[PDB]
Symmetry: D2
Subunit: 31 residues, 4 copies
Amino acid sequence: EYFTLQIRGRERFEMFRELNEALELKDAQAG
Amino acid sequence: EYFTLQIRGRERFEMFRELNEALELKDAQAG
Amino acid sequence: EYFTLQIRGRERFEMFRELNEALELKDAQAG
Amino acid sequence: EYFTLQIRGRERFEMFRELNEALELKDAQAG
């Protein structure tokens, strides 16, 4: 049930944040 | 500065989880 | 602008393959 | 074993380039 991941690095977070965002978009076009 | 990012993806999270642990190891060598 | 990247990891490649297709999708929606 | 992945992005490539180099380093620690 969900997995919280704390990232101390601001850059690293931005990366995963971009992947998480693009991942959610794929779901919209992949049910 | 830590950042909590909740993700509902076992694979997606596993990715960032490996990228976070891999990025921390590189710091030990880098400067 | 192209950069041929050769890797001996079927798993690692599969990852970037998903990230590549996910990046093109998010880029198409944005501008 | 090899998998040539043609990338058409300087940023995207830089990402996989860091993930590829970071993955190879893990092999030295884990095996």
